[PDB]
Design a binder for these strands. Structure first.
Ligand code: MET
Ligand SMILES: [Mg+2]
Lengths: 90, 111, 17, 365
RNA sequence: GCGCCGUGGCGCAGUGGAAGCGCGCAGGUCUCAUAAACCUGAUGUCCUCGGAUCGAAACCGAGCGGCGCUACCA
């Protein structure tokens, strides 16, 4: 048995200019990370960067203010659920 | 200061005040929340009535008043067309709250 | 047969708060 | 050790477990955010004021230590539309029952019925209906429900199945319930001489039905653990316990004693003659409706190569239909059934995702 | 009940004097402006309570919550 709802944290990270960054915390480690990053890069105008945390956690970077759009994209391309998302900041 | 100080902002002068009188509804003119701020002057803005619409920026505010996401806005709907509509007046956050308190706009969306 | 019961219903009701 | 096995059937949250708590004191532990999930268990002593629950008459009238009539045991089932498969299972141990209807909700509620007809089907004919939550109703409401009850209890097999309204929350009127259950749910004779045979429904536990076990006998469990085959497990009765008190022997009525593995297994005399079938001959009949859900859609006749839950004894097994005659179908099973006698069984189908009781019959060898 | 996390906010780590990292919010500084880049934070002593010992969040207990073991213990 596996938990259906895990806390995925889409945070506000301050990027160059008045612009921001979609940073994802608490990523499910089941699918290939690099592949997902590549997919994300392809779909938007973003660059994918992964910051590694020991034992559990990987910070996934996507340059820009999308949030909802990103979530929609994730929903469209299988690998991540609908309920797992949380917007953090404002 | 308006946006970013600048060498090239002192040749303008803005006059409206934070303590300005709030504008009410007219005929062929109603209130919209902004769905998503689009490019090239276009903007996707869901009306408080119950129609999706496509909003468009018409002059005036095109450089003077900058706008963001999820804002209460005066839209004069096209009388001949319907799908394309135009933004007339941006409402302040305080202004929006006052409107909400009044109950002039339907209570469905948050600031 | 209701009498027995109707009785029972009586006796509980008379035990309320 | 307890004489008899009384079951407490009924819809969900009508308070079955709560009534068990006003009668014994015991809770089924709970499940603590939900509700009863395993069969709950509890015992109690019934004495009477000639001149009760504890050797004490000075509660009403006066002192003369009430005379002990018997010690009984209950089996708290759950109430949830889906725990159907266990409650079925549980009935196999009952010697009688008490239908807890809720006084403040629409009389024939899905599970209330599902249960009731299960009862009239398996054979549990010694029934007492009970009107529970009358501590939260209008003195009119509880009588009109008594009407709908007195009217349901008509065409059906339920002549004078009395109906004792209670308050499981403030333990009111329970003593007339003890008088009902002291009249109508009589304690069946059981020839001991018979083959020592018993059903299992927990293990960390089960009920005897025919025969009697004694400390230090040699015993086996069927079908037992599997390989795909299924072999019997032998051991020696290390010990015998009812409730919290130890006994040297054990006889029908009651429950005796990792996770609950040998669930649906049975225990008999070592070196005893019992079939561990893979394929079985059921004779059988159907309901005309599917009484249980919260819709009454009419029962479709059995098509072969269909998967059906065969509830036999305490066990709950799944199986596929190889033969379809008038009232004799032949079934192929995943997990073997040890058929101790001739027997009773209960047959279900996955109607809309959740399984549903649809018909019955008799095992045949 | 056991084990770790017990915060100064989240998310990561370390046990006997030393305010531990990454992010976030709150605020500053630098630049004409924002961001990066920088510092300072907040219940003052890193569960609740007190003690052995000057002391300490760390040593010890009674008392709570999340999961790594259990399976409902008559
Ligand atoms: C649920 S096991 C059967 C009841 C027994 N008295 C114990 O407790
Ligand atoms: Mg000027």
């Amino acid at each position: 048995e596996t938990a259906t709802s895990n806390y995925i944290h889409i945070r506000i990270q301050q990027r160059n200019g008045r612009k921001t960054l979609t940073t994802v915390q608490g990523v499910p480690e089941e699918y290939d990370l690099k592949r997902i990053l590549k997919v994300l890069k392809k779909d938007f105008a973003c660059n994918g960067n992964i910051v590694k945390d020991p034992e559990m956690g990987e910070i996934i970077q996507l340059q820009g203010d999308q949030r909802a759009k990103v979530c929609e994209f994730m929903i469209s391309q299988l690998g991540l659920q609908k309920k797992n998302i949380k917007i953090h900041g404002f | 200061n308006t946006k970013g100080g600048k060498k090239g902002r002192r040749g303008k002068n803005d006059s409206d005040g934070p303590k300005r009188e709030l504008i009410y509804k007219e005929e062929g003119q109603e209130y919209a929340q902004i769905t998503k701020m689009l490019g090239n002057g276009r903007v996707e803005a869901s009306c408080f009535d119950g129609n999706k619409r496509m909003a468009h920026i018409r002059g005036k505010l095109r450089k003077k008043v900058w706008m963001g996401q999820g804002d209460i806005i005066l839209v004069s709907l096209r009388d001949f067309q319907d799908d394309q509509c135009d933004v007339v007046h941006k409402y302040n956050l305080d202004e929006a709250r006052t409107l909400k308190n009044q109950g002039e706009l339907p209570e469905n969306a948050k600031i | 047969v209701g009498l027995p019961y109707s009785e029972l219903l009586s006796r509980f009701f008379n035990i309320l708060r | 050790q307890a004489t008899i096995n009384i079951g407490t059937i009924g819809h969900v949250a009508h308070g079955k477990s709560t009534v068990v708590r006003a009668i014994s004191g015991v809770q089924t532990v709970r499940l603590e955010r939900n509700i009863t999930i395993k069969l709950g268990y509890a015992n109690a002593k019934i004495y009477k004021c000639q001149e009760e629950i504890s050797p004490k008459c000075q509660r009403p009238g006066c002192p003369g230590r009430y005379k002990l009539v018997r010690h009984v045991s209950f089996v708290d089932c759950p109430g949830h539309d889906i725990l159907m498969s266990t409650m079925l299972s549980g009935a196999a141990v009952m010697d009688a029952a008490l239908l807890l209807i809720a006084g403040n909700e629409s009389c024939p509620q899905p599970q209330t019925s599902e249960h009731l007809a299960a009862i009239e089907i398996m054979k549990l004919k010694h029934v007492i209906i009970l009107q529970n939550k009358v501590d939260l109703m209008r003195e009119e409401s509880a009588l009109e429900h008594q009407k709908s009850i007195l009217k349901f209890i008509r065409g059906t097999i339920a002549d004078g199945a009395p109906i004792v309204p209670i308050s499981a929350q403030l333990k009111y009127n329970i003593d007339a319930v003890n008088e009902f259950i002291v009249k109508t749910i009589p304690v069946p004779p059981r020839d001991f001489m018979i083959s020592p045979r018993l059903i299992v429904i927990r293990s960390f536990g089960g009920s005897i039905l025919n025969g009697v076990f004694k400390l230090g006998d040699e015993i086996e469990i069927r079908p037992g653990i599997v390989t795909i085959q299924c072999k019997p497990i032998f051991s020696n009765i290390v010990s015998l316990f009812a409730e919290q008190n130890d006994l040297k022997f054990a006889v029908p009525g009651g429950l005796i004693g990792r996770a609950d593995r040998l669930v649906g297994q049975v225990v008999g005399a070592k070196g005893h003659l019992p079939n561990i079938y893979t394929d079985i001959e059921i004779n059988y009949f159907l309901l005309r409706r599917l009484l249980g859900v919260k819709k009454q859609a009419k029962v479709r006749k059995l098509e072969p190569n269909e998967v059906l839950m065969v509830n036999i004894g305490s066990t709950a097994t799944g199986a596929r239909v190889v033969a379809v005659k008038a009232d004799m179908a032949r079934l192929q099973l995943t997990s073997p059934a040890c058929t101790e006698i001739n027997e009773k069984i209960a047959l279900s189908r996955r109607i809309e995702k959740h399984w549903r009781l649809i018909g019955w019959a008799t095992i045949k060898k």
